[PDB]
C-alpha cells in the first residue's frame, strides 16, 4: 500500500520472486486507485516487460494475477498506454493465460484482451491473429451459462463485444462467423449486463453493408432483439434499438424481418420515451422504415404510428425533429396517394410548416421536398387548392415566401417553384 514507484522498481529488480510479487502487488494497488492512477510513471519506469514476463510464471499464480491486473489497468488508458502493453509482448502471454486453471487469472486475461481489442481495429485484428477467439469461446462452451460466475461471464461477453467492434475495417468475416453462435446464446441469457453487451456486439456487427446485416439476420436473432427492445432497462434498450435501426438500413427483406417480429408495436413507447437519445434513434429507425415499400408504410399506418410521428415533429429535441422530417419525406416519396392523404388528415402540415423557421439548411430542404410530394398527391386528386389554403391558414405561405430569399440555392429554387406553381 502506497509504495513509491522507486520502491516498486527496487523490488521488481530484486532476484527474489517473493520480493517481486510484493512489488507487483504494490504496483497493482497504485494502478487501482480511484483518482489519477500513475500509468505513465509505471510505463516510464520500464516495468511493462517485467510484468509481461511474470504472466508466464505458472509456478507462481499470485504474481500472474497481480501482473495481469496491473497490465489490464495500463491497457485501460490512452492508445499510447495500450500500445506500450502490446509492445511488451502481452497479447500472446494473455492468450496463454486464458487456459489457466485459476478462474480469477483467466478472467483477468479476458479483461486485458478486451482493453487491447477495444483500442481500435488494428489491435482488435492483432488479438484475433494471435488466436484469441478459440480459447475465449472455449470458456463459454458449457451446457448452461448460469453455472459460470456472473462477473466472469460479463467480462467474457464484454471482450467478445470488443472483438465485434469498430470499422475501417470491420472485423474479419471469418471471425464474425466464428463468434456469432456464441453471441446468439448470450443474447438469450438472463443477466442484464450480458444482455446489454450482447446487444452492443450485434449493433456493431449490423453497422455496415447489407452483407454484414445478412450474416446477423440469418442467425434468427431479430425476434430476440425485438423482445429486448421492450426491456425496462435502458442499458438494454439502447443497444437493442441501435441494432434494430441498423438492420432496417438494409434491404426491404431485412426490414421486413423486423416488422414481422413485432417491432412496430414497441414504437408508441420509444417515440415518446423520456430519454432524448431513444426518441431520436427510434425516429431514425422509423425514417428507414418509411423509406421502404408501400406495404411497409402500410404497416406503419396500421400500427398507429403516424400520429406519433406528427407528435415528434410537433415537439421534441431538434435532432429528433430532423429525423422525423426525414421520416415524412421518405413516407411521401414512397407512399400511395391514400397514404399521403392520411398523413395530411393526421395533422402533418402545421408542424411541418413550423419547422421551416429552423436555422438548419438540410431540414428546410427535406421539408420542402415533403411539401412537394404532398402537392403531387393533391394534384392527382385535384385538391391542390385545398392544400394551399391549409398551408396559408397556418402561416406556411409566409415561411415559404421568405425562403425564396435564402442563401442556399436549392432552398430558393424549391420555394420559388412551390409559390409559382401553387400559390
Amino acid at each position: 500500500v502506497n509504495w513509491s514507484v522507486e520502491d516498486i522498481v527496487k523490488g521488481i529488480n530484486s532476484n527474489n520472486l517473493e520480493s517481486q510479487l510484493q512489488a507487483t502487488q504494490a504496483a497493482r494497488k497504485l494502478l487501482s486507485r480511484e483518482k489519477q492512477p500513475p500509468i505513465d510513471n509505471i510505463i516510464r519506469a520500464g516495468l511493462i516487460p517485467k510484468f509481461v514476463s511474470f504472466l508466464g510464471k505458472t509456478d507462481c499464480s499470485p504474481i500472474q494475477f497481480e501482473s495481469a491486473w496491473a497490465l489490464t489497468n495500463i491497457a485501460s488508458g490512452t492508445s499510447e498506454q495500450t500500445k506500450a502493453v502490446v509492445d511488451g509482448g502481452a497479447i500472446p502471454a494473455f492468450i496463454s493465460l486464458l487456459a489457466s486453471p485459476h478462474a480469477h487469472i483467466s478472467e483477468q486475461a479476458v479483461w486485458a484482451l478486451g482493453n487491447i481489442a477495444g483500442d481500435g481495429s488494428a489491435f482488435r485484428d492483432l488479438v484475433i491473429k494471435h488466436g484469441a477467439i478459440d480459447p475465449l469461446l472455449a470458456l463459454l462452451a458449457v451446457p448452461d451459462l448460469s453455472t459460470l460466475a456472473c462477473g466472469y461471464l460479463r467480462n467474457l461477453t464484454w471482450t467478445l463485444s470488443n472483438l465485434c467492434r469498430n470499422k475501417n475495417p470491420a472485423p474479419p468475416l471469418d471471425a464474425v462467423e466464428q463468434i456469432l453462435p456464441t453471441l446468439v446464446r448470450l443474447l438469450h441469457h438472463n443477466d442484464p449486463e450480458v444482455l446489454a453487451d450482447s446487444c452492443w456486439a450485434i449493433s456493431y456487427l449490423t453497422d455496415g453493408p447489407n452483407e454484414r446485416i445478412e450474416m446477423v439476420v440469418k442467425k434468427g436473432v431479430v425476434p430476440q432483439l425485438v423482445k429486448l427492445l421492450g426491456a425496462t432497462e435502458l442499458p438494454i434498450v439502447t443497444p437493442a434499438l441501435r441494432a434494430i435501426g441498423n438492420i432496417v438500413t438494409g434491404t426491404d427483406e431485412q426490414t421486413q424481418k423486423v416488422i414481422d417480429a413485432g417491432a412496430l408495436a414497441v414504437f408508441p413507447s420509444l417515440l415518446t420515451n423520456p430519454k432524448t437519445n431513444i426518441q431520436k434513434e427510434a425516429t431514425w429507425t422509423m425514417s428507414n422504415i418509411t423509406a421502404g415499400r408501400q406495404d411497409q408504410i402500410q404497416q406503419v399506418v396500421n400500427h398507429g404510428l403516424v400520429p406519433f410521428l406528427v407528435g415528434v415533429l410537433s415537439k421534441a429535441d431538434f435532432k429528433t425533429q430532423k429525423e422525423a422530417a426525414w421520416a415524412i419525406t421518405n413516407y411521401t416519396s414512397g407512399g400511395t396517394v391514400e397514404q399521403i392523404v392520411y398523413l395530411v388528415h393526421c395533422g402533418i402540415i402545421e408542424p411541418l410548416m413550423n419547422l421551416l423557421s429552423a436555422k438548419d439548411t438540410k431540414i428546410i430542404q427535406v421539408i420542402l421536398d415533403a411539401i412537394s410530394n404532398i402537392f403531387q398527391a393533391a394534384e392527382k386528386l385535384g385538391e391542390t387548392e385545398k392544400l394551399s389554403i391549409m398551408i396559408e391558414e397556418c402561416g406556411g405561405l409566409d415561411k415559404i415566401e421568405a425562403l425564396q430569399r435564402h442563401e442556399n440555392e436549392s432552398v430558393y429554387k424549391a420555394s420559388l417553384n412551390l409559390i409559382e406553381k401553387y400559390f
Partner: peptide, 9 residues
C-alpha cells in the same frame, strides 16, 4: 456495458 476500455479498481 458498452465501454471501449475498463479499469479494474
Amino acid at each position: 456495458s458498452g465501454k471501449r476500455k475498463k479499469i479494474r479498481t
